[PDB]
Amino acid sequence: YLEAFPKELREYYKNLFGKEEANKIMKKLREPVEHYYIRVNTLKISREKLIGELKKEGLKPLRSPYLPEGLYFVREGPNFSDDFEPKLPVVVANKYAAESVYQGAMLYAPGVLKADKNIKEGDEVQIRDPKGLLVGIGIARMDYKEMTEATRGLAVEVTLPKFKLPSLSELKAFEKGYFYPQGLPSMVTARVLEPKEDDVIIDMAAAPGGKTTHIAQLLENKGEIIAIDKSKNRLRKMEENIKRLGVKNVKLVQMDARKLPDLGIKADKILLDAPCTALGVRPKLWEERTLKHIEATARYQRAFIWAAIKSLRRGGVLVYSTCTLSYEENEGNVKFMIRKGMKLEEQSIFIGSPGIGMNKVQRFYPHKHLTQGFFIAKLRKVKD
């Protein structure tokens, strides 16, 4: 599994966590989340009512003892060994389609990069990503020709994916806005912010609106949430999400959030889900980003951070989060905040790990907490 991570990044991980831990993390990083979490949209439905609806579709949702709005599904797999060499003709899927097949999705024609020319409909085939990673096994629903020519349609019925997560996008319960797929550490982030109806609240990296709509339902559609993102297209999707979830709490604004104080607004609560190297996202088939990206991105984040701090009222609260594992983007950029009049506060919910040489921040590790790599920092602005 180590091959999914560039050499210098592996050393970085060995240096930051210790060889043994780093090897457990990278191993789990290649696999999907063991517990797949969704958020109960309490604006429309209670948790137990939703559970009833999900069980109707043959789904087995489990309750979270920590998050009353939390449900999760248990991941199936692996369904074959890491060294399994199926005696099958090969279908090569592109990068993105291979990742979804890896988690149980069918393989559709536009996801087909190339294939063995002996494949006819009904043939058992193995699916590999462009680098040879075995991600699934199934039955061809197209001949070779149609498979490499169609623009739509089922190409390979995946009957044995490497891993299985429930597909929830196609459910009535989703279309009715009863839930929103969201990770446990992401949900913790929104709780730890502790939004109040009176609070002036800014989500400066809001799209696609996961945490934004979370805050919404926590406020019970009261008050106002300002939600910012770079492109309107990302906001277009978010408007759809907001509509579906029956959220009436959010004001969308399109802008470079690094220029946030250009608004005449001093906020009480600010959530910065900062753009990051995403080193912690799962599943991680091949890690493309590396050390040069960590440094550059860590520097890139500081402009958001500094913008946030200047837009905060005295005694205001900032929640800083990333889905990355690096020190520079996390503990390092919090030390930057501490030098700029921000104080570390205890978080209302702490079920993860402590930080690296750092006490009140919260981390999530895939091997320990069955989640994505995640970082949560809650700060209080004591002075300018």
Q: Which residues of 374-384 are buried (b: 16+ CB within 10 A; e: fewer)?
A: bbbbbbebeee
Cα–Cα distance list, 232 to 91, 236, 246 (Å): 37, 6, 20
Q: Cα separation of 244 and 216, whole Å?
A: 13
Going by their DSSP bridges, the two strands 225-229 and 358-364 should be labelled as unpaired
Residue 384 annotated in ligand binding? no
Residue 262 annotated in ligand binding? no
Residue 104 annotated in ligand binding? no
Residue 211 annotated in ligand binding? yes
Give me the catalytic one of 323, 334, 337, 342.
323
Asked if omega into 86 is within 30° of 0 (cis), the reply is no
Residue 341 annotated in ligand binding? no
Q: Cα separation of 244 and 339, whole Å?
A: 42
Instruction: Give Cα 337 distance to the centre of its chain.
Output: 24
Residue 205 annotated in ligand binding? yes
Q: Which residues 6+ apart lie within 8 Å of 210 measured at CB?
A: 39, 180, 182, 186
Q: Which residues 6+ apart lie within 8 Å of 141 measured at CB?
A: 121, 153, 154, 155, 156, 157
Rg (CA), the chain: 22
Residue 256 annotated in ligand binding? yes
Residue 18 annotated in ligand binding? no
Residue 206 annotated in ligand binding? yes
276 in active site: no
Residue 300 annotated in ligand binding? yes
- Work out whether the CA dihedral 22, 23, 24, 28 comes out positive or negative: positive
In the chain, the amino acid numbered 37 is: Y
Residue 199 annotated in ligand binding? no
Residue 280 annotated in ligand binding? no
Residues that are catalytic? 323
Residues contributing to the annotated binding site for S-adenosyl-L-methionine? 205-211, 229, 234, 256, 273, 300
